[PDB]
């Protein structure tokens, strides 16, 4: 009841009881700063926890032997570790930490890494370097969070103290088990007490910007700061997603086994595939009913033009025909002591037999229980684990099938017996067809395309034509790459009559070397180019000459073109390998160089040619190697029916192959497996280790579908998790609100329990609002500007708007234009009357009412830059600039919003539905999740810049460049002149049909003579579409057909205000 | 003329939406699970 006595009037404001106000928000944010870290645990001590949260915490977490037997010093005097279980055991171990600590001043209980050990480590002691290595990597593992965990737990305690809520759609309360039935918080209380024990102040570590501090006790190990950040995510998601606690207990039990393990991160790396393997890879052993979508993609299949044509019910024959899972899924649990989890998952998975929202939410709640942490290891072991592997070529190409060198390039004779001639001819034809294009020869395009080692904390001048011919393969020869349209691909590929095969290439960077790929490619590009380009130079490299021994008869001189001169200078770079250089700040005295054959991680041109190399080898698989290496003419007939233009999609290493349904039903699911074995056999002959998968689902670009499902991965991103690669301090305070809004907008796209999710977003939003510098403080309207919907304001109905409302001025237009005749009543309801009537708010002084309630100051204060742009004195400059907006009193809104507010719309009648209600389109959303379920059916799911700004700025004002003057573009492009954009939230919906048809610019009773757009300045229609479709999406419930009603100043004088804003810029 | 947003108006929209969906002819007949006559 302590939180109740502390936060009485705020919880009723964000639970729909009382109206939200600025003074209650600021009086809460006054108190959010005034919390000790012990106060959160004092608040956790009072909640009565039920019997179904209690489970045995093991005693072996707290007693771990120290780190002396874990690390060693390699030759060349770099620190490593010796692995005990597996060669990938290179992560942070779990040992006793307290012996390497000396206490901070001003408080005795908390210590840090001692300065004598880092002094002797900089001096060059053997043990001290190991000790400071372990200390810095434990700090870096503990640091991977957005904010201190006690603030998140306190926001949970504030938000979930209002009890159950009420639904204005379902007209009933919700049934979600409260804090007494929440096992991660019981464990979070028990661990943090048992660490302290008799000692008070009870916070196992505190979090600062540069470094952490550890509680000085023998009970403290390194596994605890990732474990607590792991438990807080489940404690939040059990509330705001409506998870079943019978899955959350397994999700906590696996994390307790992870903390009890030899290492935490390594155990989670080895156990990250328990929940999808037992649940998602094993669905519907017996299928009896349910609805499935009916897509098809149109016949030019490279276009990826899709079409939704109704939904049909399933039949008995579309069960899981894929092979079994038990022999390895039970083995994974038996190796690690999780058979009580694996069998528990399998027996519960075997009870669902119909395809509806229930069995889909089962998959969502099972996938949510994986632990999303960020794996932390030193760069000096990241390199020497990742960059030391190599491909193995079981069938190399013989020395007879090469001639002598043309300079530094041997050519491949076409009478070879190996498969590499099919790789050779595609790159050869690609080079020969890109060299004949006229665009590659004017000097301006060469200047445009103009416009040693590498390390980690000049290849792009000479490696041009490799990339330039990779693009030709990706976009003209075999259009299998989709380099927004990935969704209907998988919704077709997951349908009942067709299957899908999830092909992934392991180690795409270590994949291709000079042994098989780069030699044939640099032999093909050196020959396809030299026909068209003879003597003509490139950008900056000249023509040249080099001797050859192509034919064995004689040798001669044979002048080099100049475009193949780069191939000459670049194949000697590819022939030897790459040179890297490292220096981790996590272990001193560790600074060396290293020679590999692998590629850099995240370059741009390293994706396109890998995609070309994917599609080419898949095409020669399906054409040549396929029929030549199999019996069983069902497999032969299956192979001879599909090609990569018709069914193969690849974007990186991974690919997706689709096997459509025949007339007799689905394809026999045993010949597909016989072809899978041939894919795995095919990869061994030239070094690729495929990660093929066949279960009945579709995985492409890490999106999970089953029967066309849109399953979100809740643990793809955690809530309290943030990546940190270096050891540097982070940005200052007023930029944390961008990540808090990121938490909210990432919770939008996943179908959380929306009343719970908005209510928890308010608690975070009010917790991150005040900072010492009079202190700085954002009012609650500054967050409403950032896209955060509200609950109950100005004396309205509770839970009245939706989080599909946009941000910015288009967002501020909509809810005001919906609530305005109630707001102008509430102003007069307490002494806010003036004599003149405004055309918007009437006889009430909106200026004084908004100044006293600080709505104006939030509106203009949210537009300040949160970036401390190029020192603490610049931070003080930004703070004074931010305080000046709060001290200044304001007169009105911006000219754009005031020009918007003259437009009035109407909600006549609801539109006919766009998709079936009983069809499960998307996971998590159902009639229990009422508002997205209404919006997505009423609208429909998406199943089908400075130049563009400024030329419209000069075109709409009175003034390609000859084309733009008279044409028009669509609404989403023409209405970017007033900086209006379709928001991030509407991307998974159909805004095109809504803009084109169901926003009418004409009243239902004809033409009111006030809404007369002139024939001149017809660009206004494209903005009135957005102003119409705002309120038709912000209002919760069904998206309604909306008609124009009134423009107060006239349609001619409406756009003159927009033209004044365009002159004022 | 104008109107504010009210839960009354929300329910008024939802009932019209469900009625216009319910009176669709494929929806009036189709079902997910076949019966003992259709299976025979």
């Amino acid at each position: 009841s302590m939180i109740l006595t502390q936060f009485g009037p705020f919880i009723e404001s964000i639970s729909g009881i009382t109206d939200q106000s600025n003074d209650v928000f600021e009086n809460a944010a006054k108190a959010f700063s005034m919390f000790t870290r012990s106060d959160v645990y004092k608040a956790l001590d009072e909640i009565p926890f039920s019997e179904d949260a209690m489970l045995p915490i093991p005693p072996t977490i707290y007693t771990k032997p120290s780190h002396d037997s874990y690390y060693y010093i390699d030759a060349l005097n770099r620190v490593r570790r010796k692995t005990y279980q597996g060669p990938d055991d290179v992560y942070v171990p779990n040992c006793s930490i307290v012996e390497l600590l000396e206490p901070h001043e001003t408080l005795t209980s908390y210590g840090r890494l001692s300065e004598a050990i880092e002094n002797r480590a900089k001096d060059g002691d053997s043990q001290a370097r190991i000790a400071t290595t372990y200390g810095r990597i434990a700090e870096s593992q503990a640091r991977q969070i957005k904010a201190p965990l006690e603030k998140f737990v306190l926001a949970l305690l504030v938000a979930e103290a209002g009890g159950s809520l009420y639904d204005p759609v379902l007209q009933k309360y919700d049934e979600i088990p409260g804090l007494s039935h929440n096992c991660p918080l019981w464990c979070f209380r028990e661990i943090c007490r048992h660490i302290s024990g008799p000692l008070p102040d009870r916070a196992p570590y505190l979090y600062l910007s540069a470094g952490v501090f550890w509680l000085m006790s023998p009970r403290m190990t390194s596994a605890i700061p990732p474990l607590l950040s792991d438990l807080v995510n489940l404690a939040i998601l059990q509330q705001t997603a409506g998870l079943d606690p019978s899955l959350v207990r397994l999700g906590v039990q696996i994390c307790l086994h992870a903390a009890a393990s030899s290492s935490y991160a390594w155990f989670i790396l080895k156990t990250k595939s328990i929940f999808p393997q037992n649940t998602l890879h094993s669905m519907y052993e017996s299928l009896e009913g349910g609805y499935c979508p009916n897509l098809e993609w149109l016949e030019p299949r490279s276009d990826y033009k899709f079409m939704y044509m109704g939904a049909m019910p399933l039949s008995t024959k579309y069960a899981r025909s894929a092979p079994s899972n038990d022999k390895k899924a039970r083995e994974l649990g038996e190796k690690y002591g999780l058979s009580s989890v694996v069998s528990e998952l399998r027996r519960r998975t075997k009870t669902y037999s119909k395809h509806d929202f229930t069995s889909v939410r089962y998959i969502r709640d099972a996938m949510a229980c994986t632990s999303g942490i960020f794996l932390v290891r030193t760069p000096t072991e990241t390199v020497l684990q990742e960059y030391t592997q190599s491909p193995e070529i079981k069938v190399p190409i013989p020395q007879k099938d090469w001639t002598g060198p043309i300079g530094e390039i041997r050519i491949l004779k076409d009478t070879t017996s190996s498969i590499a001639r099919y790789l050779y001819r595609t790159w050869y034809l690609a080079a020969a067809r890109m060299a004949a294009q006229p665009r590659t020869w004017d000097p301006l395009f060469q200047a445009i395309m103009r416009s040693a080692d590498t390390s980690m904390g000049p290849q792009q001048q000479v490696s041009a034509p490799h990339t330039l011919t990779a693009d030709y393969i990706n976009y003209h020869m075999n259009l299998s790459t989709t380099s927004e349209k990935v969704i209907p691909l998988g919704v077709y590929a997951s349908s009942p009559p067709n299957q899908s095969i999830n092909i992934d290439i392991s180690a795409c960077d270590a994949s291709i070397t000079w042994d098989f790929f780069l030699s044939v490619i640099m032999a093909a590009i050196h020959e396809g180019v030299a026909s068209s380009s003879i003597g003509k130079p490139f950008m900056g490299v000249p023509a040249s000459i080099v001797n050859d021994e192509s034919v064995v008869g004689v040798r001669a001189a044979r002048p080099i073109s100049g475009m193949q001169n780069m191939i000459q200078h670049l194949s000697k770079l590819y022939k030897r390998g790459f040179s890297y250089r490292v220096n981790d700040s996590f272990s001193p005295g560790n600074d060396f160089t290293h020679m590999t054959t692998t590629f850099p991680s995240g370059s741009t041109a390293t994706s396109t040619e890998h995609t070309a190399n994917n599609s080419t080898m898949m095409e020669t698989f399906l054409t040549v190697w396929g029929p030549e290496h199999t019996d069983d003419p069902d497999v032969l007939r299956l192979m001879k029916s599909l090609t990569i233009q018709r069914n193969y999609v690849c974007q990186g290493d991974d690919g997706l192959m689709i096997i459509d349904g025949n007339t007799a039903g689905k394809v026999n699911s045993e010949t597909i497996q016989k072809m899978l074995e041939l894919i795995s056999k095919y990869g061994e002959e030239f070094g690729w280790k495929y990660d093929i998968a066949y279960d009945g689902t579709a995985e492409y670009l890490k999106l999970y579908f089953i029967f066309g499902c849109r399953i979100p991965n809740l643990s793809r991103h955690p809530i309290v998790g943030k990546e940190r690669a270096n050891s540097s301090a982070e940005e200052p305070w007023p930029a944390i609100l961008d990540q808090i809004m990121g938490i909210f907008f990432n919770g939008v796209h996943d179908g959380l329990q929306w009343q719970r999710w908005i209510r928890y977003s308010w608690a975070l939003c009010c917790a991150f609002s005040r900072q010492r510098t009079g202190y700085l403080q954002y009012p609650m309207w500054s967050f409403v500007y950032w896209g955060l919907p509200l609950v109950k304001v100005f004396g309205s109905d509770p839970w009245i708007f939706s989080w599909y409302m946009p941000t910015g001025d288009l967002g501020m237009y909509s809810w005001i234009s919906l609530i305005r005749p109630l707001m102008t009543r509430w102003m007069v309801a307490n002494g806010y009357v003036t004599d003149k009537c405004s055309p918007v708010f009437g006889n009430a002084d909106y200026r004084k009412c908004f100044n006293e309630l600080k709505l104006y100051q939030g509106y203009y204060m949210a537009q300040l830059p949160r970036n401390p742009k190029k020192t603490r004195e610049e931070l003080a400059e930004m703070d004074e600039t931010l305080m000046r907006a709060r001290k200044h009193s304001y007169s009105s809104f911006s000219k754009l919003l005031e020009a918007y507010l003259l437009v009035k719309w109407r909600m006549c009648e609801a539109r006919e539905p766009s998709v079936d209600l009983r069809l499960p389109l998307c996971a998590g959303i159902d009639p229990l999740n009422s508002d997205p379920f209404l919006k997505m059916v009423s609208v429909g799911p998406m199943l089908q810049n400075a130049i563009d700004s400024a030329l419209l700025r000069l075109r709409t004002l009175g003034a390609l460049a000859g084309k733009i003057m008279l044409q028009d573009v669509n609404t989403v492009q023409l209405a970017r002149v007033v900086n209006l954009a379709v928001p991030d939230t509407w991307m998974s919906l159909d805004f095109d049909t809504m803009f084109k048809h169901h926003v009418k610019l004409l009243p239902k009773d004809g033409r009111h003579l006030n809404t007369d757009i002139p024939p001149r300045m017809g660009w206004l229609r494209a903005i009135l579409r957005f102003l119409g479709a705002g309120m038709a999406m912000t209002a919760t419930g069904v998206a309604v057909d909306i008609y124009l009603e009134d423009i107060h100043g006239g349609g001619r004088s409406l756009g003159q205000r927009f033209m004044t804003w365009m002159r004022q810029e | 003329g104008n109107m504010t947003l009210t839960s009354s108006e929300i329910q008024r929209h939802i009932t019209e939406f469900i009625s216009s969906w319910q009176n669709h002819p494929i929806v009036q007949v189709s079902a997910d699970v076949e019966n003992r006559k259709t299976a025979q």
């Binding site: 007209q171 109905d797 | 009210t6 839960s7 009354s8 329910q11």
Partner: peptide
């Protein structure tokens, strides 16, 4: 209305 939203002389006389 909110509750409803939850729910759903002499001669003249003679």
């Amino acid at each position: 209305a909110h509750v409803a939203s939850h729910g759903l002389n002499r001669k003249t006389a003679q």
